[PDB]
Structures are given as C-alpha cells and as structure tokens.
Amino acid sequence: YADSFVIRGDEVRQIAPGQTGKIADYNYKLPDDFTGCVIAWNSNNLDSKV
Amino acid sequence: FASVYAWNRKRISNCVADYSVLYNSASFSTFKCYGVSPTKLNDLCFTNV
Amino acid sequence: SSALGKLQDVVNQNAQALNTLVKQLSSNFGAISSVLNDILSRLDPP
Incomplete structure (x- = not known):
C-alpha cells in the first residue's frame, strides 16, 4: 500500500511506529509493528505560494 | 529566559498539572520523555516537579 | 521427651x-x- 500526504517540515518525525503528536495522534497513525518504509522530500517550490 | 551557565530552577509544587496542553501544543520542536512516555503523564502523581 | 534433626532438615530446606x-x-x-x-504507567507500549 502507498499512502500520500503533505505535512510541515518538522512533523516528519511523527511518521513512524510508536510515535505521538498532533499528527500521529489524530491524523495518521502507524501500527506498532510496522513493516514498510517511510519516504519524504521537501517540496517548498510546488506547494507554497506567495 | 536565563543563561545556559546559570540556568534557572523553579520548583513546581502542589497543583493540578496538565501535561496535555504541553504534549499537543505542536509548537515544540523537541519533546522527549525518558523515565515515562508522554501520554501517561496526566495519570500519575509525584512529590515535586 | 527431654534428635529429629534429619526430619527437621528436610522441612527447613x-x-x-x-x-x-x-x-x-x-x-x-x-x-x-x-x-x-x-x-x-510511565512508559508507552513500545
């Protein structure tokens, strides 16, 4: 499965197994025996506008 | 705030502490808990903080 | 009435x-x- 979304820069630390926060609490929660991989890259020029 | 070489020291005492307003404020760049994971703070009692 | 150490020792052990x-x-x-x-109570399940 591939899940996709957009978050802040310093919220990428909550996207894993056994984490907590405004994001991992109630936006997107990863089980505690996760198996896959997590990939993330900056996208300032595409998603941020003047 | 206070310098790094003379830090401050406040002795929080008998009160009603709500570490949830801290834990979910999302304004903190670093929130690590060592003796005790963060979500179980609002369910324990100590002598001094 | 006034010696059973072998029986006392197995109880004690x-x-x-x-x-x-x-x-x-x-x-x-x-x-x-x-x-x-x-x-x-002071640790998360992981």
Whole structure:
C-alpha cells in the first residue's frame, strides 16, 4: 500500500511506529509493528505560494 | 529566559498539572520523555516537579 | 521427651527454597521497577 500526504517540515518525525503528536495522534497513525518504509522530500517550490 | 551557565530552577509544587496542553501544543520542536512516555503523564502523581 | 534433626532438615530446606522463590518477585533484573503496574504507567507500549 502507498499512502500520500503533505505535512510541515518538522512533523516528519511523527511518521513512524510508536510515535505521538498532533499528527500521529489524530491524523495518521502507524501500527506498532510496522513493516514498510517511510519516504519524504521537501517540496517548498510546488506547494507554497506567495 | 536565563543563561545556559546559570540556568534557572523553579520548583513546581502542589497543583493540578496538565501535561496535555504541553504534549499537543505542536509548537515544540523537541519533546522527549525518558523515565515515562508522554501520554501517561496526566495519570500519575509525584512529590515535586 | 527431654534428635529429629534429619526430619527437621528436610522441612527447613523446602521452606528456605520457597521463600527464596517469592523474594525474587522484588528484583529488577535491570529494569526500572519490579512492578508491572509501574512499567505500564510511565512508559508507552513500545
């Protein structure tokens, strides 16, 4: 499965197994025996506008 | 705030502490808990903080 | 009425072993406490 979304820069630390926060609490929660991989890259020029 | 070489020291005492307003404020760049994971703070009692 | 040491010793040995078994329920073995209601109260499941 591939899940996709957009978050802040310093919220990428909550996207894993056994984490907590405004994001991992109630936006997107990863089980505690996760198996896959997590990939993330900056996208300032595409998603941020003047 | 206070310098790094003379830090401050406040002795929080008998009160009603709500570490949830801290834990979910999302304004903190670093929130690590060592003796005790963060979500179980609002369910324990100590002598001094 | 005024010698049964071989019978007393087998009683004593068994009691001394059963007490050592219970007295081990209060060692950490390298943990934060000896109580499961204390590791299940100041630690997250992971």
